[PDB]
Design goal:
It is classed as hydrolase. Two copies of one chain form a homodimer. With 261 residues, chain A is of the alpha+beta class. Helices cover 34% and strands 25% of the residues of chain A. The structure holds 1-hydroxysulfanyl-4-mercapto-butane-2,3-diol, chloride ion (CL) (2 copies) and magnesium ion (6 copies).
Chain lengths: 261, 264
């Protein structure tokens, strides 16, 4: 009853944002964080601060865990929003396409509302506990079963040793990459991909995905097959249920997926 | 009669725009066959689009000849005055697995010279076309030459499954990052738009790269063999389409250390 009303507000703040992003891009500035491949723009900072604003205006006891700010906070919180203000910043800057806003609301640690907004295609994926998962308002259904050898898979090949990359190439139908965790994960949710791996995501990179995986019967675990703490990064996979185990075993086999060189 | 290029372009665009009405039905009744091996796919979508275009050609340009993927091309010579090259669905695997990330490729060569080219991104309804003497366009929005992109500042795309893993690693190290759409025509347009620095296909057929000649010409792109030579539009060859400022570096990374084949 209440989720539906908070959802309307979120969907509304997301409508205002279509009208703000053009201006932000028009005046785009770009900085590096940890190294030259780690980008941040005023688009990331401003979407985030404006959400911060929204929360302060309508839910000021709700807390925010977000990418472009310090997050010294607890293990604990009743109302928690996790936000990736732009997921796919390299894609934003390099391509001005294939990036999204990721948002997720947790109530007493339980995911309740999730948003992955593909702003370049004006496609909003949302998940609402009690109602379902939607893409621009049409109900998404559990994808068909996909075994690994019938599935396209997606992952960052530069962060794994090449033997494991090759085992992954050999077991799956093919390999693609979108370059945004939220959008590669939505492909799994839609059934276009069998699995998306990210071996070092941050909580904002994967926060919306928990509710989508639950409502659509996906598997979403660490690369050791365990539950992921929504509050803390872990190496993670989101997968069709019929290829999940096969990917984990390949990832873990022959000394594991990490670089040795 | 005798037509201007603009008249020919008007015909093609409308035929392409008309295919929007046909495709939803073909996709809902989608059936797949195999070609060279179990994963070399062809669908009723590929076959109907190419059949309708051959019939469009017999209707409007009866002297014109068709070089296309889903038929034999034994009768195609180098003497041909009016030739179309078609990939009816470029990215069939994507059509089958995703119903996204595939396109229709067409190009017209007058006496061996590219005059008209089309990469129709149907799932998104974006028509990229290039018309000699007019320019290149994405939905009638004119495209211009992309900014210089050094490899180290550029995203690149290639099939990493078909190359020496060492070359792959070198390609990763030297570029800003890696991405893959999975249709040559679509990965090529990302280069034409300045979104990727380069796309490589080490074994394209003529129809995978036919439209791209004129786009590279109109937009100042480098489009060459992996040896840096001209490509024969009639015969496949290993190929790169690239921003100007990163083409040399990519080709040297490819040919380094005995080259990019898995056995070197
Ligand atoms: S597939 C949609 C394509 O046009 C996006 O830009 C890449 S995910
Ligand atoms: Cl996407
Ligand atoms: Cl594309
Ligand atoms: Mg970032
Ligand atoms: Mg981000
Ligand atoms: Mg992110
Ligand atoms: Mg084919
Ligand atoms: Mg084809
Ligand atoms: Mg093709």
């Amino acid at each position: 009853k209440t989720l539906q009303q908070i959802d309307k507000l979120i969907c509304s703040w997301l409508k205002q944002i279509d009208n703000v992003i053009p201006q932000l891009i028009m005046e785009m500035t770009t900085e590096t964080k940890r190294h030259r491949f780690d980008l941040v723009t005023n688009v990331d900072k401003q979407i985030q601060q404006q959400f911060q604003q929204f929360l302060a205006t309508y839910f000021p006891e709700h807390q925010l865990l977000a990418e472009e700010k310090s997050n010294a906070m607890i293990t604990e919180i009743n109302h928690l929003w996790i936000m990736d203000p732009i997921d796919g910043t390299a894609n934003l800057v390099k391509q001005q396409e294939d990036y999204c806003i990721i948002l997720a609301y947790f109530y007493e640690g339980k995911p309740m509302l999730s948003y992955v907004y593909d702003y370049p295609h004006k496609k909003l994926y949302k998940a609402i506990r009690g109602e379902g998962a939607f893409c621009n308002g049409i109900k998404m259904e559990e994808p068909p079963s996909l075994k690994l050898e019938d599935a396209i898979i997606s992952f960052n090949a530069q962060v794994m040793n090449l033997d494991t990359v090759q085992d992954l190439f050999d077991a799956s139908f093919s390999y693609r990459l979108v370059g945004a965790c939220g959008l590669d994960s939505m492909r799994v949710a839609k059934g276009q991909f069998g699995a998306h791996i990210n071996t070092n995501p941050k909580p904002w990179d994967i926060a919306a995905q928990f509710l989508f995986a639950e409502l659509l019967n996906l598997k979403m675990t660490t690369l050791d097959g365990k539950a992921i703490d929504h509050l803390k990064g872990a190496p993670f996979i989101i997968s069709n249920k019929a290829c999940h185990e096969t990917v984990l075993k390949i990832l873990n086999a022959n000394g594991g997926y990490q670089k040795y060189r």
